[PDB]
């Protein structure tokens, strides 16, 4: 219902997130996905690494510059998974894909904005316990992505800043909850409690 929806992609399964995001884009919702290096794919790492190398094998034989373009970053693996769930050769699907932004880490503006989850796509809600899974940053590093260490450094910095934000936000909501508790047991607050409020 938001003008853009910011999905924190951590702990999400790539296909179950990509079909949901593909339907939101085609239904007209702008979606930005962050922390794409923290995405999950079900099945073991060697399993999914062999899958990527099987994908990496296929290219145009007379010119490898016009082949399937094997994009290596985790946001680009998510983008490739989400293409193919969109008619991207039509104008409508091109306009749908223009509604999507996928990033590794949480860069600016989005680091001071609310991030949501898609519980249809959450790994801890979908996979049976004991089932192995792959983290997309580790898989991307194995197949040639260069920037795992930079994203980890910037995410550690961003989390230090975000925790200093949240300490002040708890310090404020202490006072707000106590001041709402002082207004309780008054003739206005009992009147509001009579109406479910």
């Amino acid at each position: 219902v938001e003008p853009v929806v910011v999905i924190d992609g951590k702990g999400h399964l790539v296909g179950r997130l990509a079909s949901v995001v593909a339907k939101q884009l085609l239904n007209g919702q702008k979606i930005v996905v962050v922390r794409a290096e923290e995405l999950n794919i079900s099945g073991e790492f060697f399993r999914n690494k062999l899958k990527y190398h099987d994908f990496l094998r296929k290219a145009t034989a007379f010119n490898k510059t016009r082949g399937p373009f094997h994009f290596r970053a985790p946001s680009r693996i998510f983008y490739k998974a989400l293409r193919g769930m969109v008619s991207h050769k039509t104008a409508r699907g091109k306009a749908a894909l223009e509604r999507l932004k996928v990033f590794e880490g949480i860069p600016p503006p989005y680091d001071k904005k609310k991030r949501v989850v898609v519980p249809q796509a959450l790994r801890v809600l979908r996979l049976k316990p004991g089932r192995k899974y792959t983290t997309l940053g580790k898989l991307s590093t194995s197949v040639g992505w260069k920037y795992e260490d930079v994203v980890a450094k910037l995410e550690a910095k961003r989390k230090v800043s975000s925790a200093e934000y949240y300490a002040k936000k708890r310090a404020f909501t202490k006072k707000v909850a106590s001041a709402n508790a002082t207004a309780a047991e008054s003739d206005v607050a009992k009147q509001l409690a009579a109406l479910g409020y």
Binding site: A61, F62, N63, Y147, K153
Partner: protein
């Protein structure tokens, strides 16, 4: 069906496309790994290829049959006047790669490097860096804010240097401007080194040392459009061939119904960017040193220049680098010498080279004499007027 006889490929598919390079100055696409315990040094230097000569030296190679005997070795001479440090550039690490944050230039730039910013210098009002020069003018606070941004951010510090091509016997007068990484300690101390060295010159002696393995990065000599016989070294077709011999006979099977990228074709040969590695420095010769070309074993008062000059180059009045062997590019060309990216312990490195003799006869013919004094002593006196 199969090829019926095995032969290896003609040419290397990792040097593709064989196109003309985008500039005459080849790019340094990797710099040495930074150790922040070392002092702040340039990782690279700029120079011009003067030409080759040959040397004699003793060999220190135990187990070789030619141990402690003399060998004749070709050496390339790169004329290296000192570079002028004019800028600094800050680079932050981003998830999309390295990004230049800002550049800080020095207050005064010579017409050599200003001429790089002009296609038509002779018609120009020469306004380059005139409003930039008025940011130093009050107290330089707008320069120190930018240097503080480079110190605060910028995990990599590169320095802008230009060549002194007027100290150099070329008709060019327009300097080459490059970015050399500052290896060494402490991003802040890199910025301090660069700001100290603004408008100053860095000599090739304080960057390169003798017996150092270095890399040459240069654009090779151009030859224009070339056929496949010399571009890829394919076999020539027999004398009986109709429609030409200097060709690849089969350029593909029927399927895939396309010419493949691995099939050798006529096109541009040369003027390609090449990075050749592990050339040993045999001499770092000073420019303010009569007897550039003398050794401890010869001690004949002679410079590095041959009689008649270097062919198509001219004389060397500057510092130079005598490096072993062959490096890409032809004579007069700007070449970037870089430190070795790895630490080599291969016993062909770590050999301390001492020259016994440097050939200084004319390269404009089959020279017979090393000095005009030797020529006069051999020939006596001629008819030419006194």
């Amino acid at each position: 069906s199969h090829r019926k006889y095995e032969a290896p490929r003609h040419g290397h598919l990792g040097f593709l496309p064989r196109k003309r390079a985008a500039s005459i100055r080849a790019r340094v696409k990797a710099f040495p790994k930074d150790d922040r315990s070392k002092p702040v040094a340039l990782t690279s230097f700029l120079g011009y290829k003067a030409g080759m000569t040959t040397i004699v030296r003793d060999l220190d190679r135990p187990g070789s049959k030619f141990h402690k005997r003399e060998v004749v070795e070709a050496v390339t001479v790169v004329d290296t006047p000192p570079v002028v440090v004019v800028g600094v550039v800050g680079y932050v690490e981003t998830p999309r790669g390295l990004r230049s944050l800002t550049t800080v230039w020095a207050e005064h730039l010579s017409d050599e490097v200003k001429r790089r910013f002009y296609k038509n210098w002779y018609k120009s009002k020469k306004k380059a860096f005139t409003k930039y020069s008025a940011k130093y003018a009050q107290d330089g606070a707008g320069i120190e804010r930018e240097l503080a941004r480079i110190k605060k951010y910028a995990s990599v510090v590169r320095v802008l240097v230009h060549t002194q091509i007027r100290k150099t016997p070329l008709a060019q007068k327009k300097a080459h401007l490059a970015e050399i990484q500052l290896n060494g300690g402490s991003i802040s101390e890199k910025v301090d080194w660069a700001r100290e060295h603004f408008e100053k010159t860095v000599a090739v002696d304080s960057v390169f040392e003798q017996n150092e393995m270095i890399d040459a990065i240069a654009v090779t000599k151009g030859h224009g459009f070339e056929g496949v016989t010399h571009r890829w070294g394919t076999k020539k077709l027999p004398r009986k061939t109709h429609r030409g011999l200097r060709k690849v006979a089969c350029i593909g099977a029927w399927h895939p119904a396309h010419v493949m990228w691995s099939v050798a074709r006529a096109g541009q040969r040369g003027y390609h960017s090449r990075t050749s590695i592990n050339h040993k420095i045999y001499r770092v010769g000073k420019g303010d040193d009569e007897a550039n070309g003398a050794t401890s074993f010869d001690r004949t008062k002679k410079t590095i220049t041959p009689m008649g000059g270097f062919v198509h180059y001219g004389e060397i009045k500057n510092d130079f680098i005598m490096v072993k062997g062959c490096i890409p590019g032809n004579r007069k060309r700007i070449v970037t010498l870089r430190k070795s990216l790895y630490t080599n312990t291969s016993r062909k490195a770590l050999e301390e080279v001492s020259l016994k003799w440097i050939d200084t006869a004319s390269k404009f013919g089959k020279g017979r004499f090393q000095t005009p004094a030797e020529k006069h002593a051999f020939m006596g006196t001629l008819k030419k007027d006194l």
